[PDB]
Amino acid sequence: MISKEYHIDEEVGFALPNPQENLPDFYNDWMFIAKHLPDLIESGQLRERVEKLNMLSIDHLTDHKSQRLARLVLGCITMAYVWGKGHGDVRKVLPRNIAVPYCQLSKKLELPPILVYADCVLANWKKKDPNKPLTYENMDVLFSFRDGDCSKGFFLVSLLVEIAAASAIKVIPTVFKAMQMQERDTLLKALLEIASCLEKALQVFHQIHDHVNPKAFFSVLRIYLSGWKGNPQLSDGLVYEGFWEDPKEFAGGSAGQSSVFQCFDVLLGIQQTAGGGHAAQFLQDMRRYMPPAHRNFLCSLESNPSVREFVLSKGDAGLREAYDACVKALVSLRSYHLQIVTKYILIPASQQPGTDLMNFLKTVRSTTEKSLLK
Ligand SMILES: O=C(Nc1ccc(F)cc1)C1(c2ccc(-c3ccc(C4CC4)nc3)cc2)COC1
């Protein structure tokens, strides 16, 4: 058993199970905007609309799911407001009527006031048919930015990979129990199962091509996911009017915000967040952009003993082969993510009349390769 305090689902892992679609009536003015962003942005009514909103309390967002749906709604509106039509005409100040509730809600959920992976992937989905299984074809996102933005493809394939890797997450207790009870055969079986789920996760990742378009992604969706930390477009950051007197920098959406993106590297003793390098700094900093229960989960993995030391100590080819099966699977995932960045960011950028992400991932991959045993 993984503790329920870590918010991990048997079926969907780190994803929020059955995310709420609708808010209470008190927040109808937020939902009218968030549900109609494609029209409200393409006609320039979005910015004016947000300015005409009253400042609403967060006291009526009672349960976790409602609070998370609101974080998604406000996060998407914040991005839509800041970036507008997404042609470099930017807002350096977020209006108090939306800033105050978003910042208060954010502090309550222990997340930064900006759209993160946990919002727009982990909570931004529904099933069409509850009886049918979790396939792309039985699924939809709750919110989008623009028509043709491929948010469905981008978020749902991302989500499907998260789900696929969650099959391994439930093996992790088996892994730690087998070490302390010195159960070689159990540990071997666990590591081969983990390798198998990450192999499946990669096959799932292939769907990205079927549902996402390079032009659309680069020109449109990338812009809406962009944040304001070390971004020339908002040099000093964003002003959360009525909450902070001074502007504040926050990072945009990133796969590094996925707890699955990190947790196996941790489990397998791949010291990604050790180094003192930019990649190690980035990964650690993104733990603050994950929900608190999830970042706690990563922390408890780190506190448990080292799987890598355990395998190394034993002089056991079979265990080393199973540990390496897992390492190989992660390498492949990194390699694949790089091909996606190449097709969807590098090449489109070149046609415009990526590099930092490439170098970031090359380092992560290289650190992974160097963790192989044989
Ligand atoms: O960028 C991505 N989604 C993304 C979504 C929302 C954002 F706000 C920002 C980004 C993509 C991606 C998806 C999964 C991984 C991934 C998941 C697990 C692992 C295992 C190895 C640990 N590896 C990779 C990497 C990227 C989708 O296509 C690119």
Tab-separated table of C-alpha atoms and ligand atoms in Angstrom:
chain	number	residue	atom	x	y	z
A	1	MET	CA	0.000	0.000	0.000
A	2	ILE	CA	1.075	3.533	-0.945
A	3	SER	CA	-0.330	5.884	1.730
A	4	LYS	CA	-3.473	7.870	0.765
A	5	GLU	CA	-1.727	11.020	2.164
A	6	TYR	CA	0.389	11.003	-1.063
A	7	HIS	CA	-2.742	11.316	-3.353
A	8	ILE	CA	-1.874	8.453	-5.723
A	9	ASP	CA	-4.673	6.568	-7.492
A	10	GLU	CA	-4.556	2.826	-8.293
A	11	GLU	CA	-5.813	3.461	-11.851
A	12	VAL	CA	-4.527	6.927	-12.789
A	13	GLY	CA	-1.600	7.438	-10.338
A	14	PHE	CA	-0.618	11.111	-9.927
A	15	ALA	CA	-3.554	12.215	-12.118
A	16	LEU	CA	-6.586	13.579	-10.347
A	17	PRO	CA	-9.258	10.838	-10.555
A	18	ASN	CA	-12.583	11.941	-12.101
A	19	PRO	CA	-11.874	15.700	-12.102
A	20	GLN	CA	-14.854	18.006	-11.528
A	21	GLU	CA	-16.218	19.639	-14.713
A	22	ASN	CA	-18.403	22.328	-13.147
A	23	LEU	CA	-18.143	24.796	-10.271
A	24	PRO	CA	-20.810	26.035	-7.883
A	25	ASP	CA	-23.167	28.751	-9.168
A	26	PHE	CA	-21.279	31.425	-7.168
A	27	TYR	CA	-18.429	31.167	-9.747
A	28	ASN	CA	-20.492	31.255	-12.989
A	29	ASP	CA	-18.600	34.339	-14.270
A	30	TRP	CA	-15.290	32.383	-14.134
A	31	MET	CA	-16.752	29.390	-16.014
A	32	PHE	CA	-18.370	31.593	-18.724
A	33	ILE	CA	-14.887	32.939	-19.541
A	34	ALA	CA	-12.862	29.687	-19.205
A	35	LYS	CA	-15.307	27.622	-21.272
A	36	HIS	CA	-15.265	30.217	-24.127
A	37	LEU	CA	-11.567	31.182	-24.456
A	38	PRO	CA	-11.288	30.351	-28.203
A	39	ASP	CA	-14.052	32.859	-29.046
A	40	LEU	CA	-13.174	35.396	-26.341
A	41	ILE	CA	-9.501	35.515	-27.376
A	42	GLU	CA	-10.097	35.420	-31.178
A	43	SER	CA	-12.530	38.387	-30.813
A	44	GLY	CA	-10.551	40.335	-28.148
A	45	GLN	CA	-13.376	40.167	-25.575
A	46	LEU	CA	-11.258	38.116	-23.090
A	47	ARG	CA	-9.196	40.910	-21.560
A	48	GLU	CA	-12.144	43.325	-21.236
A	49	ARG	CA	-14.318	40.485	-19.778
A	50	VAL	CA	-11.792	39.692	-16.998
A	51	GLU	CA	-11.516	43.378	-16.013
A	52	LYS	CA	-15.343	43.494	-15.533
A	53	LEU	CA	-15.338	40.538	-13.054
A	54	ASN	CA	-16.006	41.116	-9.342
A	55	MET	CA	-13.504	39.900	-6.735
A	56	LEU	CA	-14.948	36.549	-5.574
A	57	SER	CA	-14.126	34.747	-2.304
A	58	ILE	CA	-12.603	31.222	-2.292
A	59	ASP	CA	-14.679	30.277	0.800
A	60	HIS	CA	-17.223	28.370	-1.389
A	61	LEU	CA	-14.642	26.017	-2.975
A	62	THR	CA	-15.024	23.375	-0.271
A	63	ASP	CA	-13.526	20.039	-1.429
A	64	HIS	CA	-10.152	19.321	-3.130
A	65	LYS	CA	-11.651	18.638	-6.572
A	66	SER	CA	-13.583	21.921	-6.720
A	67	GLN	CA	-10.451	23.815	-5.588
A	68	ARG	CA	-8.419	22.065	-8.321
A	69	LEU	CA	-11.002	22.789	-11.047
A	70	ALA	CA	-10.862	26.454	-10.018
A	71	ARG	CA	-7.046	26.460	-10.233
A	72	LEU	CA	-7.425	25.203	-13.821
A	73	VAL	CA	-10.103	27.783	-14.729
A	74	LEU	CA	-8.215	30.746	-13.251
A	75	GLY	CA	-4.857	29.444	-14.545
A	76	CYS	CA	-6.138	29.272	-18.133
A	77	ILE	CA	-7.757	32.722	-17.793
A	78	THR	CA	-4.482	34.102	-16.374
A	79	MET	CA	-2.584	32.721	-19.387
A	80	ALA	CA	-5.212	34.026	-21.807
A	81	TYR	CA	-5.113	37.457	-20.162
A	82	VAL	CA	-1.317	37.648	-20.026
A	83	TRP	CA	-0.604	36.412	-23.577
A	84	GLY	CA	-3.827	37.616	-25.298
A	85	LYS	CA	-4.077	36.484	-28.955
A	86	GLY	CA	-0.485	35.232	-28.494
A	87	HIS	CA	1.331	37.588	-30.892
A	88	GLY	CA	3.609	39.216	-28.270
A	89	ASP	CA	1.131	41.814	-26.984
A	90	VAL	CA	1.541	41.186	-23.245
A	91	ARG	CA	-0.061	42.219	-19.881
A	92	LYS	CA	2.491	42.958	-17.112
A	93	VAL	CA	-0.255	43.294	-14.440
A	94	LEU	CA	-2.989	40.773	-13.557
A	95	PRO	CA	-6.134	42.548	-12.241
A	96	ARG	CA	-6.846	42.330	-8.481
A	97	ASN	CA	-10.364	40.877	-9.000
A	98	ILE	CA	-8.840	37.679	-10.468
A	99	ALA	CA	-5.330	37.971	-8.884
A	100	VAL	CA	-6.434	37.937	-5.234
A	101	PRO	CA	-8.620	34.778	-5.405
A	102	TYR	CA	-6.096	32.957	-7.657
A	103	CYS	CA	-3.198	33.772	-5.285
A	104	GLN	CA	-5.247	32.867	-2.167
A	105	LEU	CA	-6.437	29.577	-3.732
A	106	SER	CA	-2.865	28.876	-4.877
A	107	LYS	CA	-1.464	29.436	-1.339
A	108	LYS	CA	-4.230	27.158	0.033
A	109	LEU	CA	-3.286	24.299	-2.374
A	110	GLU	CA	0.485	25.059	-1.884
A	111	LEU	CA	1.063	25.710	-5.614
A	112	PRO	CA	2.354	28.793	-7.391
A	113	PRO	CA	-0.181	31.179	-9.021
A	114	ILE	CA	0.430	30.008	-12.597
A	115	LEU	CA	-0.926	27.207	-14.780
A	116	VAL	CA	1.103	24.047	-14.093
A	117	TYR	CA	1.162	20.468	-15.387
A	118	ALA	CA	-1.069	19.375	-12.492
A	119	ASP	CA	-3.732	21.856	-13.649
A	120	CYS	CA	-3.775	21.497	-17.434
A	121	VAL	CA	-2.944	17.768	-17.735
A	122	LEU	CA	-3.717	16.030	-14.438
A	123	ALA	CA	-7.026	17.847	-13.777
A	124	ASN	CA	-8.031	18.898	-17.344
A	125	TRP	CA	-9.743	15.730	-18.520
A	126	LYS	CA	-13.066	13.855	-18.565
A	127	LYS	CA	-14.327	10.507	-19.885
A	128	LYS	CA	-16.988	10.732	-22.589
A	129	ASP	CA	-18.443	7.327	-21.655
A	130	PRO	CA	-17.787	6.326	-17.963
A	131	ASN	CA	-18.301	2.638	-18.869
A	132	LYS	CA	-15.658	2.650	-21.621
A	133	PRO	CA	-11.934	2.545	-20.642
A	134	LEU	CA	-9.282	5.316	-20.539
A	135	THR	CA	-8.334	5.577	-24.227
A	136	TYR	CA	-7.788	8.780	-26.246
A	137	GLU	CA	-11.018	8.027	-28.150
A	138	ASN	CA	-13.179	7.886	-24.959
A	139	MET	CA	-11.606	11.149	-23.626
A	140	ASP	CA	-11.752	14.948	-23.828
A	141	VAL	CA	-10.049	17.886	-22.130
A	142	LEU	CA	-12.112	20.276	-20.012
A	143	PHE	CA	-10.486	23.484	-21.322
A	144	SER	CA	-8.620	24.840	-24.335
A	145	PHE	CA	-7.038	28.157	-25.368
A	146	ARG	CA	-7.628	28.410	-29.144
A	147	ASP	CA	-9.274	26.462	-31.934
A	148	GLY	CA	-6.611	24.363	-33.648
A	149	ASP	CA	-4.221	24.566	-30.636
A	150	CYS	CA	-3.976	20.735	-30.222
A	151	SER	CA	-4.503	21.007	-26.459
A	152	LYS	CA	-6.578	17.802	-26.557
A	153	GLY	CA	-3.736	15.856	-28.174
A	154	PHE	CA	-0.964	17.500	-26.152
A	155	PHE	CA	-2.609	17.213	-22.737
A	156	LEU	CA	-4.355	13.823	-23.163
A	157	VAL	CA	-1.369	11.981	-24.662
A	158	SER	CA	0.681	13.512	-21.825
A	159	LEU	CA	-1.992	12.284	-19.396
A	160	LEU	CA	-2.143	8.825	-20.987
A	161	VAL	CA	1.640	8.452	-20.550
A	162	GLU	CA	1.272	9.582	-16.900
A	163	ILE	CA	-1.440	6.929	-16.401
A	164	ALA	CA	0.621	4.225	-18.138
A	165	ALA	CA	3.616	4.865	-15.896
A	166	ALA	CA	1.299	4.787	-12.839
A	167	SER	CA	1.084	0.998	-13.340
A	168	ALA	CA	4.684	0.927	-12.012
A	169	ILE	CA	3.961	3.273	-9.089
A	170	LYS	CA	2.065	0.545	-7.161
A	171	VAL	CA	5.131	-1.777	-7.499
A	172	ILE	CA	7.311	0.680	-5.481
A	173	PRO	CA	6.251	-0.594	-2.051
A	174	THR	CA	7.016	-4.141	-3.272
A	175	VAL	CA	10.515	-2.921	-4.220
A	176	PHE	CA	11.236	-1.410	-0.755
A	177	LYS	CA	9.688	-4.344	1.139
A	178	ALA	CA	11.725	-6.923	-0.818
A	179	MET	CA	15.003	-5.138	0.063
A	180	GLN	CA	14.426	-5.021	3.850
A	181	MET	CA	13.033	-8.593	3.848
A	182	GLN	CA	15.879	-9.667	1.483
A	183	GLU	CA	13.530	-11.227	-1.084
A	184	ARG	CA	15.686	-11.482	-4.219
A	185	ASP	CA	13.062	-13.097	-6.420
A	186	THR	CA	10.401	-10.533	-5.407
A	187	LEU	CA	12.756	-7.611	-6.066
A	188	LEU	CA	13.629	-9.031	-9.507
A	189	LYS	CA	9.937	-9.436	-10.415
A	190	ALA	CA	9.199	-5.897	-9.204
A	191	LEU	CA	12.003	-4.345	-11.275
A	192	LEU	CA	10.940	-6.300	-14.424
A	193	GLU	CA	7.337	-5.108	-13.901
A	194	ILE	CA	8.521	-1.517	-13.528
A	195	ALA	CA	10.547	-1.884	-16.752
A	196	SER	CA	7.463	-3.291	-18.468
A	197	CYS	CA	5.231	-0.295	-17.551
A	198	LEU	CA	7.776	2.264	-18.780
A	199	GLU	CA	8.082	0.274	-22.012
A	200	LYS	CA	4.260	0.536	-22.320
A	201	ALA	CA	4.375	4.242	-21.419
A	202	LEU	CA	6.672	4.893	-24.421
A	203	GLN	CA	4.367	3.061	-26.856
A	204	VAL	CA	1.551	5.291	-25.519
A	205	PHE	CA	3.748	8.396	-26.146
A	206	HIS	CA	3.723	7.564	-29.906
A	207	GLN	CA	0.091	8.845	-30.149
A	208	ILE	CA	1.406	12.431	-29.830
A	209	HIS	CA	2.077	12.349	-33.588
A	210	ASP	CA	-1.476	11.291	-34.410
A	211	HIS	CA	-3.130	14.223	-32.610
A	212	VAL	CA	-0.654	17.148	-32.472
A	213	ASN	CA	0.623	19.305	-35.311
A	214	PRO	CA	4.123	20.946	-35.220
A	215	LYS	CA	2.995	24.332	-36.635
A	216	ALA	CA	-0.006	24.554	-34.267
A	217	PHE	CA	2.004	23.532	-31.191
A	218	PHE	CA	4.904	25.913	-31.740
A	219	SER	CA	2.949	28.972	-32.909
A	220	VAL	CA	-0.063	28.724	-30.548
A	221	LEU	CA	-0.023	26.264	-27.646
A	222	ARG	CA	3.620	26.741	-26.589
A	223	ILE	CA	2.847	30.482	-26.100
A	224	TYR	CA	-0.102	29.818	-23.797
A	225	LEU	CA	1.922	27.407	-21.644
A	226	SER	CA	4.815	29.900	-21.328
A	227	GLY	CA	5.477	31.451	-17.937
A	228	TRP	CA	7.357	34.502	-16.713
A	229	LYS	CA	10.668	33.422	-15.118
A	230	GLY	CA	13.682	34.554	-17.163
A	231	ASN	CA	11.347	35.575	-19.986
A	232	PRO	CA	12.321	38.822	-21.835
A	233	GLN	CA	8.615	39.500	-22.550
A	234	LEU	CA	8.012	39.944	-18.779
A	235	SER	CA	11.488	40.862	-17.517
A	236	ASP	CA	10.664	41.532	-13.825
A	237	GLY	CA	7.819	38.957	-13.750
A	238	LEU	CA	4.060	39.398	-13.374
A	239	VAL	CA	2.303	41.754	-10.965
A	240	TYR	CA	-0.364	39.985	-8.915
A	241	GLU	CA	-2.236	43.238	-8.244
A	242	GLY	CA	-3.705	43.485	-4.741
A	243	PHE	CA	-1.627	40.491	-3.519
A	244	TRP	CA	2.039	41.485	-4.084
A	245	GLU	CA	3.238	45.094	-4.413
A	246	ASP	CA	6.202	43.842	-6.506
A	247	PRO	CA	6.198	41.648	-9.630
A	248	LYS	CA	6.843	37.923	-9.186
A	249	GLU	CA	8.458	35.380	-11.535
A	250	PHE	CA	7.030	31.849	-12.087
A	251	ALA	CA	7.972	29.114	-14.569
A	252	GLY	CA	5.669	27.991	-17.371
A	253	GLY	CA	4.316	24.498	-17.893
A	254	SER	CA	6.882	21.744	-18.295
A	255	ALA	CA	7.059	17.936	-18.371
A	256	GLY	CA	9.535	18.343	-15.466
A	257	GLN	CA	6.483	19.159	-13.364
A	258	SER	CA	5.312	15.532	-13.818
A	259	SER	CA	6.015	13.494	-10.679
A	260	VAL	CA	6.335	10.417	-12.926
A	261	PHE	CA	9.032	12.385	-14.875
A	262	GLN	CA	11.130	12.411	-11.675
A	263	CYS	CA	10.038	9.554	-9.388
A	264	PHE	CA	11.666	6.612	-11.205
A	265	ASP	CA	14.968	8.468	-11.494
A	266	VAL	CA	14.698	8.862	-7.719
A	267	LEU	CA	13.603	5.250	-7.074
A	268	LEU	CA	16.484	3.918	-9.176
A	269	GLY	CA	19.095	6.152	-7.522
A	270	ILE	CA	19.738	8.218	-10.665
A	271	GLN	CA	21.033	11.375	-8.994
A	272	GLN	CA	19.413	13.851	-11.440
A	273	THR	CA	18.875	16.542	-8.778
A	274	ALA	CA	22.519	16.070	-7.633
A	275	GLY	CA	25.173	17.915	-9.686
A	276	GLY	CA	24.877	21.622	-8.958
A	277	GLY	CA	24.026	21.993	-12.684
A	278	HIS	CA	21.110	23.835	-14.312
A	279	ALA	CA	19.240	20.554	-14.962
A	280	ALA	CA	19.507	19.461	-11.320
A	281	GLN	CA	18.372	22.937	-10.189
A	282	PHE	CA	15.403	22.931	-12.572
A	283	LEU	CA	14.142	19.490	-11.500
A	284	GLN	CA	14.333	20.363	-7.808
A	285	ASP	CA	12.618	23.743	-8.364
A	286	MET	CA	9.762	22.050	-10.277
A	287	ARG	CA	8.936	19.988	-7.176
A	288	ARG	CA	7.403	23.228	-5.840
A	289	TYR	CA	5.139	23.254	-8.974
A	290	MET	CA	3.801	19.765	-8.119
A	291	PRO	CA	0.935	19.307	-5.619
A	292	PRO	CA	2.247	19.061	-2.044
A	293	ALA	CA	1.317	15.374	-1.548
A	294	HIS	CA	3.207	14.435	-4.690
A	295	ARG	CA	6.309	16.409	-3.818
A	296	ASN	CA	6.106	14.707	-0.411
A	297	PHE	CA	6.038	11.349	-2.205
A	298	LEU	CA	9.271	12.166	-4.075
A	299	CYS	CA	10.777	13.231	-0.794
A	300	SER	CA	9.893	9.911	0.892
A	301	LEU	CA	11.363	7.926	-2.014
A	302	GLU	CA	14.630	9.793	-1.434
A	303	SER	CA	14.498	8.978	2.276
A	304	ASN	CA	14.084	5.249	1.638
A	305	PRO	CA	17.248	3.214	1.062
A	306	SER	CA	18.977	3.044	-2.336
A	307	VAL	CA	17.798	0.363	-4.794
A	308	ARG	CA	21.013	0.969	-6.814
A	309	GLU	CA	23.338	0.282	-3.893
A	310	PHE	CA	21.271	-2.792	-3.057
A	311	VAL	CA	21.552	-4.307	-6.545
A	312	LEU	CA	25.263	-3.394	-6.834
A	313	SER	CA	26.050	-5.013	-3.475
A	314	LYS	CA	24.615	-8.443	-4.314
A	315	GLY	CA	26.843	-9.721	-7.192
A	316	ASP	CA	23.710	-10.820	-9.021
A	317	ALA	CA	23.502	-10.622	-12.848
A	318	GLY	CA	19.727	-11.197	-12.906
A	319	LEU	CA	19.036	-8.221	-10.619
A	320	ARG	CA	21.462	-6.050	-12.577
A	321	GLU	CA	19.683	-7.046	-15.809
A	322	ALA	CA	16.313	-6.097	-14.283
A	323	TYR	CA	17.628	-2.824	-12.866
A	324	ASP	CA	19.134	-2.056	-16.329
A	325	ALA	CA	15.820	-2.901	-18.016
A	326	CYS	CA	14.331	-0.017	-16.019
A	327	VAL	CA	17.268	2.292	-16.804
A	328	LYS	CA	17.036	1.438	-20.544
A	329	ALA	CA	13.285	2.226	-20.483
A	330	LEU	CA	13.878	5.694	-19.016
A	331	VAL	CA	16.660	6.361	-21.531
A	332	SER	CA	14.207	5.551	-24.318
A	333	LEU	CA	11.615	7.880	-22.843
A	334	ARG	CA	14.198	10.704	-22.750
A	335	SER	CA	15.350	9.952	-26.291
A	336	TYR	CA	11.717	10.050	-27.426
A	337	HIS	CA	10.914	13.313	-25.664
A	338	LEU	CA	13.938	14.792	-27.503
A	339	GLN	CA	12.537	13.651	-30.875
A	340	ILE	CA	9.267	15.363	-29.915
A	341	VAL	CA	11.118	18.563	-29.044
A	342	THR	CA	12.943	18.276	-32.364
A	343	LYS	CA	9.795	17.804	-34.502
A	344	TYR	CA	7.554	20.191	-32.511
A	345	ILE	CA	9.928	23.023	-31.425
A	346	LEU	CA	13.329	22.988	-33.222
A	347	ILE	CA	12.079	22.490	-36.792
A	348	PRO	CA	9.079	24.929	-36.567
A	349	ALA	CA	11.340	27.550	-34.934
A	350	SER	CA	13.725	27.206	-37.925
A	351	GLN	CA	10.905	27.901	-40.452
A	352	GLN	CA	9.905	31.099	-38.556
A	353	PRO	CA	10.818	34.148	-40.754
A	354	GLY	CA	14.063	24.756	-27.961
A	355	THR	CA	17.865	24.562	-27.515
A	356	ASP	CA	17.714	24.968	-23.696
A	357	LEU	CA	15.156	22.170	-23.406
A	358	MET	CA	17.227	19.939	-25.717
A	359	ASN	CA	20.326	20.516	-23.551
A	360	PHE	CA	18.302	20.012	-20.397
A	361	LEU	CA	17.000	16.614	-21.663
A	362	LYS	CA	20.344	15.540	-23.136
A	363	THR	CA	21.810	15.957	-19.644
A	364	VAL	CA	18.949	14.021	-18.045
A	365	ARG	CA	19.367	11.243	-20.633
A	366	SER	CA	23.119	11.207	-20.304
A	367	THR	CA	22.850	10.963	-16.478
A	368	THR	CA	20.418	8.081	-17.022
A	369	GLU	CA	22.771	6.251	-19.460
A	370	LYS	CA	25.637	6.615	-16.970
A	371	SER	CA	23.491	4.778	-14.324
A	372	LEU	CA	23.522	1.475	-16.282
A	373	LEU	CA	25.415	-1.310	-14.496
A	374	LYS	CA	26.727	-3.887	-17.029
B	1	LIG	O1	5.810	18.239	-22.980
B	1	LIG	C1	4.923	17.437	-22.847
B	1	LIG	N1	3.839	17.654	-22.079
B	1	LIG	C2	3.540	18.824	-21.370
B	1	LIG	C3	2.218	18.956	-20.955
B	1	LIG	C4	1.819	20.077	-20.255
B	1	LIG	C5	2.724	21.080	-19.981
B	1	LIG	F1	2.333	22.174	-19.305
B	1	LIG	C6	4.034	20.963	-20.404
B	1	LIG	C7	4.448	19.851	-21.098
B	1	LIG	C8	5.029	16.136	-23.565
B	1	LIG	C9	5.586	15.111	-22.633
B	1	LIG	C10	4.803	14.149	-22.037
B	1	LIG	C11	5.380	13.215	-21.206
B	1	LIG	C12	6.755	13.251	-20.918
B	1	LIG	C13	7.343	12.218	-20.039
B	1	LIG	C14	6.584	11.630	-19.018
B	1	LIG	C15	7.152	10.649	-18.248
B	1	LIG	C16	8.447	10.261	-18.493
B	1	LIG	C17	9.024	9.154	-17.660
B	1	LIG	C18	10.517	8.928	-17.911
B	1	LIG	C19	10.029	9.348	-16.527
B	1	LIG	N2	9.146	10.811	-19.478
B	1	LIG	C20	8.647	11.754	-20.246
B	1	LIG	C21	7.540	14.221	-21.533
B	1	LIG	C22	6.946	15.146	-22.363
B	1	LIG	C23	3.798	15.743	-24.418
B	1	LIG	O2	4.688	15.549	-25.529
B	1	LIG	C24	5.767	16.268	-24.926
